[PDB]
XYZ file of C-alpha atoms in Angstrom:
99
model
C -92.602 126.217 55.245
C -91.392 124.824 58.574
C -89.963 127.134 61.294
C -88.026 126.308 64.362
C -89.827 127.655 67.416
C -90.356 127.534 71.122
C -93.476 127.719 73.246
C -94.042 127.110 77.025
C -90.267 126.117 77.277
C -90.774 123.515 74.498
C -88.934 123.420 71.193
C -90.978 122.512 68.201
C -91.006 122.536 64.428
C -93.877 124.649 63.142
C -95.557 123.958 59.829
C -97.573 126.766 58.240
C -100.816 125.491 56.810
C -103.720 127.630 55.601
C -105.970 126.673 58.599
C -103.060 127.349 60.882
C -99.758 126.102 62.132
C -99.036 122.429 62.941
C -96.423 121.506 65.456
C -94.127 118.632 66.101
C -91.912 118.490 69.268
C -88.179 118.263 68.686
C -87.464 116.094 71.782
C -89.813 113.218 70.823
C -91.409 113.870 67.490
C -94.908 113.904 69.030
C -97.425 115.933 67.009
C -100.380 118.120 68.142
C -103.437 116.093 67.108
C -105.720 119.061 67.536
C -103.723 120.914 64.842
C -104.215 117.845 62.604
C -107.982 118.065 63.172
C -108.032 121.818 62.502
C -106.216 121.041 59.225
C -109.056 118.695 58.213
C -111.392 121.777 58.554
C -113.350 120.366 61.379
C -115.264 122.708 63.664
C -114.561 122.865 67.423
C -117.470 120.741 68.622
C -116.644 118.059 66.054
C -112.834 118.149 66.789
C -113.713 117.591 70.525
C -115.954 114.648 69.616
C -113.259 113.032 67.518
C -110.590 113.618 70.118
C -112.700 112.103 72.874
C -113.600 109.042 70.699
C -110.660 108.344 68.428
C -107.635 109.836 70.238
C -108.061 109.806 74.098
C -108.057 105.984 74.091
C -104.550 106.232 72.551
C -101.249 107.166 73.978
C -101.412 111.000 74.369
C -100.726 114.069 76.486
C -103.512 116.599 77.199
C -101.904 119.997 77.387
C -104.637 122.364 78.474
C -102.515 124.232 80.878
C -99.632 125.219 78.611
C -101.287 128.334 77.313
C -100.849 129.375 73.715
C -100.906 127.753 70.222
C -99.059 124.909 71.969
C -102.253 123.719 73.776
C -103.885 120.590 72.535
C -103.746 116.858 72.624
C -100.316 115.605 71.631
C -99.723 112.144 70.337
C -96.800 109.894 69.143
C -95.740 110.379 65.550
C -97.116 107.020 64.342
C -100.543 107.837 65.856
C -100.537 111.326 64.312
C -99.858 109.697 60.910
C -102.838 107.349 61.368
C -105.028 110.249 62.270
C -103.815 112.404 59.382
C -104.529 109.470 56.920
C -107.957 108.711 58.321
C -109.079 112.321 57.840
C -107.329 112.612 54.491
C -104.727 115.302 55.344
C -101.679 113.050 55.318
C -100.346 114.221 52.098
C -100.748 117.912 53.177
C -98.904 117.323 56.505
C -96.350 114.852 55.117
C -93.587 117.524 54.899
C -93.724 118.011 58.749
C -94.021 114.324 59.499
C -90.897 113.357 57.558
C -89.109 116.621 58.489
């Protein structure tokens, strides 16, 4: 399911996945790419490696100051879709993307 929520003054849509929740911002449809990587079942050291190699060269926002589940690397919707496809979780996260 997808809940409406707010964190650090930001309104998001929260999708409840087994590995955790995945968020999309209401204002611009950006998605938390860290949540996408957690959904692919990647451990922390590997998620960091992938973010530093595949995502930081992309348009993104590094939220490491906004404490909470909100923290992470946020990316445009189209870039999050690519990432989700690459690591084969696109069909699992599809509801949130098209939501």
